[PDB]
């Protein structure tokens, strides 16, 4: 842990000092007999290094709807607002991820700070449920599984396997 | 931010959530649509890294007067105990360091750990008041003072300077 000067209010004094871990603060310097107290920070409020500051920093306002915190306010950090799941951010707040419709696919997974992004199946893949998550699957393999393709599939379904 | 594997209790989903930082908990886990929250460790309890842990560990007992905190419980470290300054620790608890006498003078310094290491002041230096923190000064040069030695010093007190 490293030090900081701090100029002794009585004796005038630079005493070199202890600095205080993240997450609390210096409630009482050293002097020339006796080493300084570290306090924890009060709710609200927060450090993020080992410091010598006499009071905490304080937390940004709370997130608002519908966003929501990916990091609380705590000791050793200020609260870290995000879009919940699902959502992504554009100007002032969120909107839902694209969802992809029957025959497309995810190409780019959706985040906190971009949309989903979808592209078409491939041949030989299909995605036959609407997401705004899923990628195209590949057909079942009717060759190697003993059995022949009776219907060819589609951009949104199987192709479907049996026999005769 | 590191992440940490969770079963997930309703669908058996073997998830992975974002870790809670240093002084935080996860005081609900990840699920598959909503995110891990953390709360700050409780008063008495404290966290060291980034985790996944749903309780704080708890904080030692209080340190045994005359010993001190050199870090207190926080959300961040367990209190760590000391002996005071101008104290050393020696088997159960604190003794004061030795004071070095008139005539000797700290060789080396005393630490929370080790007693204050004396020794006799070297010709040409002095120590005049008991301390367990001065080292032996050198005399006073009377020659580069446009002075001369009136009466020679002695381990105990520095030569006097003057004239004629």
């Known amino acids: 842990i490293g030090t900081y000067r701090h100029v002794d209010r009585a004796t005038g004094q630079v005493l070199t000092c202890d600095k205080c871990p993240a997450g609390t603060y210096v409630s009482e310097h050293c002097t020339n007999t006796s080493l300084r107290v570290c ?8 450090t993020r290094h080992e410091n010598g500051i006499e009071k905490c920093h304080d937390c940004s306002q709370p997130c608002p709807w519908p966003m929501i915190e ?15 799941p699902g ?25 906190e700070t971009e949309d989903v992004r ?32 009776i219907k060819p599939g589609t951009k949104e379904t199987d192709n479907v396997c049996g026999t005769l």
């Open 39 to 46: 306090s924890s920070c009060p709710v609200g409020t927060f």
């Open 118 to 149: 979808c592209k078409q199946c491939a041949r030989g893949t299909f995605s036959d449920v609407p997401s705004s998550v899923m990628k195209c699957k590949a057909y079942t393999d009717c060759l190697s599984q003993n059995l022949v393709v």
């Open 87 to 111: 959502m992504f951010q554009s100007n002032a707040t969120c909107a839902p991820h694209t969802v992809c419709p029957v025959g497309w696919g995810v190409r780019k997974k959706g985040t």
């Open 70 to 84: 990916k990091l609380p306010c705590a000791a050793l950090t200020d609260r870290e607002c995000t879009c919940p």
